[PDB]
Every structure is written in structure tokens, then in C-alpha cells.
Structure 1
Amino acid sequence: SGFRKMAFPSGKVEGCMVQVTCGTTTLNGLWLDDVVYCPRHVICTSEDMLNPNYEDLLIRKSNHNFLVQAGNVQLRVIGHSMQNCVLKLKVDTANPKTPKYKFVRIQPGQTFSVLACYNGSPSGVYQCAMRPNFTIKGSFLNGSCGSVGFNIDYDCVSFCYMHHMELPTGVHAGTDLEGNFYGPFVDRQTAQAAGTDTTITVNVLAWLYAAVINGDRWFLNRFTTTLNDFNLVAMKYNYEPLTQDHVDILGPLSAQTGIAVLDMCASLKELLQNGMNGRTILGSALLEDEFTPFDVVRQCSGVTFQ
């Protein structure tokens, strides 16, 4: 037993990270087969970034302007192109450590692992979720641009995030691997703000099921509620609406514990109305919302990868 915020093993992604230098800017890139992916603002300078025209800036570059370092081995660039907000630099060598992989664009509420890197070298790994307002609450410093987020399924790495920028409230914004931003943000140094966030209701319920699987049961009651009456309380406390699709996804966890989904909703309602009154759940004094129903089942059942 036990329950922890668990990331995927990161070895398959470590073997893909490289350093990309152009002018006075250094950031991280992702090396898969004979292409390196990185954020397009690597072609900017500390005065280009105020309002750049990237097409007009890229047509002024040559291949040899791009310095790509893989360990202490130099890869030279033989072509380049821009796709939305990412650069694709073609190099003369295929990465022999290329795993099986895919690019995927995720929905708000889904979770992923982040391998934070500086100068092409990995620093640490942690678990994140895409918030309803399309930011992520990460841990990023100068030079971390180009670090990626990912999920692993068997032997296949599904890449879903590349890091670009930090907003004034201390949260983070970036793109999928095809260079499209999550949210309304643009890669320009001008006023933008996150928009108000909300709590991911379906994930909170999944975490209450994890507590029961592990022996915490003090928060249950004998009451119940309808979906509509629950959603009327949820709106009041700034929670996202729960759909019937969400109810259906929580089926397996309901069947393993014997607690109907709408009975667990009546328990959340009482916790929202009464607080916790000095008690904890799975070592937490707040209601936690960055575990999906999938996350709970993998950790409480023991699925591996290869």
C-alpha cells in the first residue's frame, strides 16, 4: 500500500535531449531520428522578443548559425524549417537511442511527467496536470525552454508538451510538439494573463477512491445526491461540472470499492460544506486534483512498462 505522486521512468527521454545554441541564446532540443525539435524563439535576441516577425527573421539565417551539441559531440545542421511555434532542424546523423514514439495533443485535466533540463542535461522529473485554464504549475528557471512532458504506454513514448515561457503569476505555458500553444498565449513579450482557474472535479473523486482502496474511510456517509444537485454545489465552490462521461470513466473504481459514484459525490459535497475539521486524506489537508482515474488504477494495481 501507500499513495505517492508518481512520475514515469525517464530513461527513454533522457537519451533524446540535446543543446541548441544560436547567437546568444541557449536552450534544449529533442533529437528523434535525424531531426531536432526546439522552440522558435531561439532565433530571437533580448530585443527581438518584444514584437518579432519570425518568418522575416528566419529567412536571414544560414544552417551554420545553429550549433547543436549532443554530449560532447557536435551535430551539424543540413536544413531547417518552421512549423507554427517550433523549429525543425535536420541533422546528418540519426539518433541511435530513438525510442518508439508519438506526438499527442492532450485535453485539460490530463496528467504527464516533465523532465526538466538545462544545456541539454536532465535535472529532475516530476508529475504535472494541464489546468482548465491551459497553464501548468511547474518548476522552471532560465534555460529550461525545450524541456518536454510525456506519458509512457508499454514501450511507446507519447510526447505532449514543450516548455516556452512563464507568466506573471508564476505558472507556465507552452506548446504541443507540433508547435501549437495550449491556451490563448503567444510567444511574444507582451501583456497576457491566465484567466481564472477551477478545480478538476473528476480527479478529486478518483483520489477519494484511492483513499478508500488504501484504508481511509472517515469521510464517507450514508447520503446520496443527484447529478444536478451535486453540480449546483460544485459551481458555488469553483469546481468544474461533472458530466455523465466522467461518471462512466469512474466505473471501474466504483466496482472495485463498492461505492456508487453518486454516493462519493455526496461525500465530496459534505467535505466542501464542512471542511476537513482537522483531519487528513492520504497525507493531505487539501482536496487533491492532479491524479486521473487512470493514474489511480496504475498505482493501486502495479502496471509496468518496457
Structure 2
Amino acid sequence: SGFRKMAFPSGKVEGCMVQVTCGTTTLNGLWLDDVVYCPRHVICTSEDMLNPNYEDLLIRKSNHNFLVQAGNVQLRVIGHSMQNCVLKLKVDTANPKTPKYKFVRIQPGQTFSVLACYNGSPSGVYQCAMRPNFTIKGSFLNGSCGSVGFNIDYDCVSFCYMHHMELPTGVHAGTDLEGNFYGPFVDRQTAQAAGTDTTITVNVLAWLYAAVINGDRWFLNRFTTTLNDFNLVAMKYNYEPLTQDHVDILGPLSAQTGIAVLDMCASLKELLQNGMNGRTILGSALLEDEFTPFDVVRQCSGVT
């Protein structure tokens, strides 16, 4: 028993991290097969970031200007290309530690682990969620660009995020591994304000199910609600609307606990309206939304 914010074991991704330097900029790259992926802003100086023309800046770069180092050994760059906001550096050596992998573009509400790196060296691993406004609340200092987000299914790593930017509000923006930003963000140092950071309702309900499974049951009430009634309260509290797809996804947690999804919605509704009253749920004084229903099932069953 016990319920923790857990990240995937990072070993498979650690074997892919490399350091990429272009001029005076050093950031992280992801080495899979004979390609190194990194943010295209590696070619920008701090000055260029204010209004960069990436195609024009890239013309002044040749293969030998991209310095790729894996551990303390240099990789030979034999090609380079820009795909959206990522650069793909073809190297002459396939990464011997390349795991089975996929590139996936996640939806808001989905969680993933981030391996924060500096100079191609992993420093830490944490668990995140793609917010409904397409930002992530990460922990990234200068030099962390190119650090990646991923999920693991047994032995296959699905890479879903690459770190690019920090908005003026301290929240983070990045791309999938095809170089397309999540949300409306651009790799330019300009006014980019995030939209409403709503709460991921289906994730909160999943976490309330985890709480019940782990013994924290004080919040369970004698009420029920409907999807429409619940959603009126959810809109008022800046919670994402709950759909029948979400109810279907919570089905196994409902079955395991014997608590109908709409009953849990009514408990959540009273928690929103009454507050926690100084109490905690799974050691938290607020409603946690960075566990998906899949995460709750995985952690509560022990998927390796």
C-alpha cells in the first residue's frame, strides 16, 4: 500500500542523452539509432532568440559546427536537417543503447516522466502532466533544453516531449519529437501568455479512487450526481468537463472499489464546495490531478 507520485525508471532514456553544442550554446540531445534530436534553438545566440529566422540561421551552419558528445566521446555528424522546431543530426554511429521506441504526441491531461539533464548528463527524474493549456510545470534551469518526457510500456519507450522554453511566468513549453510545439507556443523570446490552467478532472477522480484503495476514505459522502450537474460545478471551479469517455476510462477503478463514478463525482463536488477543512487525502492538502486513471491502475497493480 501507499501512493506516490512515481516516475518511470529512467535507465533506458539515460542511455540516449548526449550533449549538443553549437557555437556558444550547449544543450541536451536525444540519440536514437544514428540520429540526434535537439531543439533547433541550439543555433541561436541569446540575441537571436528575440526574433529568430531559423532557416536563415541554419544556412550559416555546417555538419562540423554541431558538436555531439556521448559520455566523454565525440560523435561524427554526417548530416543535419530541421523538422519543425527540432534539429535532427545524423551521426555515423547508431546508439548501441537505443531502446525500442516510439514518438507519440500526447493529449492534455496525460502524464509522463521527465529526465532533466545538463550537458548531456541526467540530473533527475520527475513525473509531470501536459496541462490543459499545453504548458508543463517542470523544473528546468538553463542548459536543460533538449531534456525529454516519456512513458514506458514494458520495454518500449514512447517519447512525448522535448523541453524548449520557459514562459515569463515560469511555466514550461516544448515539442513532441517531430518538433511540433504543444499548444500555441513558439521558440522565440517574446510575450507568450498561457491560457487557463484548469484542473484535469478525470485525473482527480482517479486519484480519489487511489485514496479509497489505500484507506483514505473520509471524503466519501452519501450523495450522487449526474454528469451535467457535476459539470456545472466543475466549470465554476475551473475543472475540465467530464465526458462519458472519462467515465468509461474510470470503469475499472469503479469496479475495484464498488463506488460508482457518479458517486465519486458527488464526493468531488462536495470537496470543491466545502474544501478540505484542514484535512489531507494521500498526504496532500489539495486535489491532485497529475495521476491518470492508467497510472492509478498501474501503481495499484504493480506493472513493471
Deviates more, 1:268-277 or 1:122-131: 268-277
Looking at structure 2, the residues matched to 48 and 208 of structure 1 have their Cα atoms a distance apart, in angstroms, of 47
Looking at structure 1, the residues matched to 218 and 170 of structure 2 have their Cα atoms a distance apart, in angstroms, of 36
**Taking every aligned residue pair, what percent have the same amino acid on both sides?**
100
Looking at structure 1, the residues matched to 46 and 223 of structure 2 have their Cα atoms a distance apart, in angstroms, of 60
Q: CA deviation at 1:216?
A: 1.3
Alignment deviations for residues 75-99 of structure 1 (CA, whole Å, 9 cap, x no partner): 1111111100000111111111111
Looking at structure 1, the residues matched to 268 and 212 of structure 2 have their Cα atoms a distance apart, in angstroms, of 13
Alignment deviations for residues 228-273 of structure 1 (CA, whole Å, 9 cap, x no partner): 1111111111111100110110000000000101011111111111
Q: CA deviation at 1:22?
A: 0.9
Could you tell me the TM-score, scaled by structure 1's length?
0.98
The residue that corresponds to 1:298 in the other structure is 298
Q: CA deviation at 1:220?
A: 1.1
Looking at structure 2, the residues matched to 259 and 189 of structure 1 have their Cα atoms a distance apart, in angstroms, of 48
Looking at structure 1, the residues matched to 47 and 222 of structure 2 have their Cα atoms a distance apart, in angstroms, of 63
Deviates more, 1:42-51 or 1:101-110: 42-51
The residue that corresponds to 1:120 in the other structure is 120
Looking at structure 2, the residues matched to 221 and 188 of structure 1 have their Cα atoms a distance apart, in angstroms, of 49
Q: CA deviation at 1:223?
A: 1.4
Secondary structure in 2 matching 1:262:
helix
- Is 1:79 the counterpart of 2:79 in the alignment? yes
Looking at structure 1, the residues matched to 233 and 65 of structure 2 have their Cα atoms a distance apart, in angstroms, of 58
Q: CA deviation at 1:112?
A: 0.1
Q: CA deviation at 1:34?
A: 0.7
Q: CA deviation at 1:61?
A: 1.3
Q: CA deviation at 1:41?
A: 0.8
The residue that corresponds to 1:129 in the other structure is 129
Looking at structure 1, the residues matched to 275 and 63 of structure 2 have their Cα atoms a distance apart, in angstroms, of 60
Q: 1:157-236, aligned counterparts within 5 Å?
A: 157-236=157-236
Looking at structure 2, the residues matched to 114 and 82 of structure 1 have their Cα atoms a distance apart, in angstroms, of 23
Secondary structure in 2 matching 1:283:
coil
Alignment deviations for residues 202-234 of structure 1 (CA, whole Å, 9 cap, x no partner): 111111100110111111122111111111111
Q: CA deviation at 1:49?
A: 1.4
> Is contact 2:134-2:173 (8 Å) kept?
yes
Could you tell me the TM-score, scaled by structure 2's length?
0.99
Looking at structure 1, the residues matched to 219 and 71 of structure 2 have their Cα atoms a distance apart, in angstroms, of 52
The residue that corresponds to 1:287 in the other structure is 287
Q: CA deviation at 1:46?
A: 1.9
Q: CA deviation at 1:44?
A: 1.1
Where does the alignment leave 5 or more consecutive residues of structure 2 unmatched?
Answer: none
Deviates more, 1:54-63 or 1:83-92: 54-63
Q: CA deviation at 1:117?
A: 0.3
Looking at structure 1, the residues matched to 95 and 89 of structure 2 have their Cα atoms a distance apart, in angstroms, of 13
The residue that corresponds to 1:22 in the other structure is 22
> Is contact 2:168-2:191 (8 Å) kept?
no
> Is contact 2:20-2:29 (8 Å) kept?
yes
